[PDB]
């Protein structure tokens, strides 16, 4: 769904 590198609220 969402690229992990775009998510600032979850640790990749």
């Amino acid at each position, epitope marked *: *769904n*969402v*690229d992990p*590198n*775009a*998510n*600032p*609220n*979850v*640790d*990749p």
Partner: antibody
Amino acid sequence: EVQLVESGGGLVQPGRSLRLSCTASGFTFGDYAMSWVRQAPGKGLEWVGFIRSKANGGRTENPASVKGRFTISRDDSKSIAYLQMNSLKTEDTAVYYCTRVELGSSWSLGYWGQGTLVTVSS
Amino acid sequence: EIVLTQSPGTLSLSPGERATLSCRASQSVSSTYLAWYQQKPGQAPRLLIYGASSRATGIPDRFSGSGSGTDFTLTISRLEPEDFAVYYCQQYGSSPWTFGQGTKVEIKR
């Protein structure tokens, strides 16, 4: 209420370095991701990177335009976010805004500082 | 990178009219990852709408958003004098986060 104050801007020559500070108050700084956005004179907004909260690893992401030159860091004991700007070019001339990244599934930039002007010129 | 194209570049309207601002994305973006910002002359940007349709704290009722996929809309039901400003859309669902080039709402004459 939330307050974000950028500092450290000013006149700098190409190839040199600057460190911007973003002093935060009115919220639990360490709980939030922080992000820098810049606006060149007369132009639009450009994302310059974010840093996650310590609880989410505290690592950073940057666009290609500043990759390898700009580094975001944070000092949670002081509630300050930093932007280390190396190898500066004239194209880096801009007002630099510090922003708080909202919690949850929709991480917009909920609060902005007044910005600090960085002028790169010889 | 997802390019956000805002149109029109300049919106010429009278106070009290309705403003409809468009933001078209080169790629499909979930509404969850789109936001709108307002920049008044001489001021820093401020958050208006996020998640395509959800209002930020303290933003008046006349601002609303809609859309999904590639075509998004910001609606100002009635323009107040302070609403004449620049508006940016932003997507944060893919890296790099990107902003549109901005739409200016100016007084028509």
